[PDB]
Amino acid sequence: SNNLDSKVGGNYNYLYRLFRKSNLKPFERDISTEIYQAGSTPCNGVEG
Amino acid sequence: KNIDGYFKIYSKHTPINLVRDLPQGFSALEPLVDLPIGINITRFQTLLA
Numbered sequence A: 001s002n003n004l005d006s007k008v009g010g011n012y013n014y015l016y017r018l019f020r021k022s023n024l025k026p027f028e029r030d031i032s033t034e035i036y037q038a039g040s041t042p043c044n045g046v047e048g
Numbered sequence B: 001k002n003i004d005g006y007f008k009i010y011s012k013h014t015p016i017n018l019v020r021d022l023p024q025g026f027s028a029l030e031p032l033v034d035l036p037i038g039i040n041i042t043r044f045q046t047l048l049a
């Protein structure tokens, strides 16, 4: 699709979930936008 | 029930004569329809008239 999906420097219409608290079962769609917390410190919707 | 997102609907209707609680008798349900929706159902509610 490089002749199509590639536009200028990037296309943000196609996104993905990079982080998840565990391994998700197959054939599942996760729309949760919650910030991934790897520690015990509360993220509160911001990076840190 | 569900299998990998396949909702299994098994419907059986038989006439009975009952006061309260449950009658004692054997029943084998039959499939009605199939709804391969593929969504997670964590809760349900019964609708009444």
Ligand SMILES: *[C@@H]1O[C@H](CO)[C@@H](O)[C@H](O)[C@H]1NC(C)=O
Pocket: A025, A028, B005, B040, B041, B042
């Ligand atoms: C449905 O959600 C429950 C509670 O989060 C989870 O335990 C279960 O694995 C989920 N099932 C499916 C089919 O996604």
